[PDB]
Ligand binder design. Sequence first.
Ligand SMILES: CCn1cnc2c1c(=O)[nH]c(=O)n2C[C@H]1CC[C@H](CNS(=O)(=O)c2ccc(OC3CCOCC3)c(F)c2)CC1
Length: 127
Amino acid sequence: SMNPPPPETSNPNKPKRQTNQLQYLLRVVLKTLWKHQFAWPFQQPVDAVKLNLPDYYKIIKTPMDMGTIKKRLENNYYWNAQECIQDFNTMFTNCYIYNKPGDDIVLMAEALEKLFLQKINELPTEE
Ligand SMILES: CCn1cnc2c1c(=O)[nH]c(=O)n2C[C@H]1CC[C@H](CNS(=O)(=O)c2ccc(OC3CCOCC3)c(F)c2)CC1
């Protein structure tokens, strides 16, 4: 089958902004999760062909991955922290929807989500 095009990371028609919360999401949250030994399956869009994940894009219609989030933060794509947090939550939810409970990738996502929630607990107030 074919993969879909990846999510956009910049759009010249969408307003762009940098806030200190978004800078924390890039410099602290994303960086912490990215280096985690479990992060690699989440660093790029699912290539369903090459991963032989059957029906991935029949089931997952809102794909999201940390590479996309990283590029969106780097391009000031998000207007607020809620939009960025939603993308992390979509990434985790997709993994929990497509995969069987107790699969290794689910346990990996749960570990990353636990760390994510730890880092978001200390999100700074807006400056
Ligand atoms: C997220 C999108 N995506 C990308 N690849 C995807 C998916 C998707 O949604 N479902 C998919 O199936 N895949 C393929 C898999 C293939 C296997 C790969 C893990 N292999 S591993 O790094 O060698 C490894 C790590 C940790 C292990 O054990 C610990 C023990 C306690 O806690 C955590 C587990 C372990 F035994 C083996 C994980 C992706």
